[PDB]
Amino acid sequence: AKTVLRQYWDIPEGTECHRKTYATTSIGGAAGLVVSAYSVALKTPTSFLEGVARTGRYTFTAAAIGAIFGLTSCISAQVREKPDDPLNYLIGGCAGGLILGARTRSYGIGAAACAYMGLTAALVKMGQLEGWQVFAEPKV
C-alpha cells in the first residue's frame, strides 16, 4: 500500500487526472476489500452468492468514493490553477461524502460524511504541504 500512495504524490498536483483517479480508485477499492474481508469472516453469509454480493456492494462503494474524490480534486486544481490549495481537497472530500450518502440512501449520512470527509481530506493536503507526521520516526 506504499507504492500506490507514492504513485499519487509523485504526480504534479492538478494535472494528469486519469493517472490520479486510478490511484484513488485503487486505494478506495483496497479499503472496501478489507472491510468486506472482515465482514464476510465475522458475519458469515447464508450462501456463497450472498458473500460475493456483499463484497461487491462494499468494494464498489469504496471505489466510487475513491474515484470521485481523486477526480474532483484533480480538476479543481486544474480549473483554478491552485495546485497547493487545501480547498481543492475539501471540494473533493465532500464530493466523496455525498456518494456515501447516495449509496447508503440517507441524506444525513451524506451530509455528515461531506463535512467530516471534507475536513479530513483538507487536513491531508495541509500536512503534505507542511510535512506533518502521523507515524513519526523517533528522534529524541
Binding site: 500500500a1 506504499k2 478489507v34 474481508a37 469472516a41 465475522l42 458475519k43 458469515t44 455528515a112
Partner: protein, 55 residues
C-alpha cells in the same frame, strides 16, 4: 430552531450517535471461536499483502 435543534444536532447529538453505532458493531459478536480465528488469518495476510510489515 437554533439553540434546541441545530446546535444540538451537529456537534453533540451526531458525535454521540456515531459512537453508539460503532460500539454495536465491535460488540455484535457471537463468541464463535470459528469466526474469530478466521479474522486472525485475515490480519496476518493483510499485514503482508498490503502493508508490507514483514519487510
Amino acid at each position: 430552531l437554533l439553540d434546541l435543534i441545530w446546535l444540538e444536532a451537529i456537534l453533540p447529538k451526531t458525535i454521540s450517535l456515531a459512537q453508539m453505532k460503532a460500539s454495536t458493531l465491535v460488540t455484535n459478536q457471537k463468541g464463535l471461536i470459528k469466526l474469530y480465528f478466521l479474522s486472525f488469518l485475515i490480519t496476518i495476510l493483510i499485514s503482508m499483502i498490503l502493508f508490507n510489515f514483514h519487510e
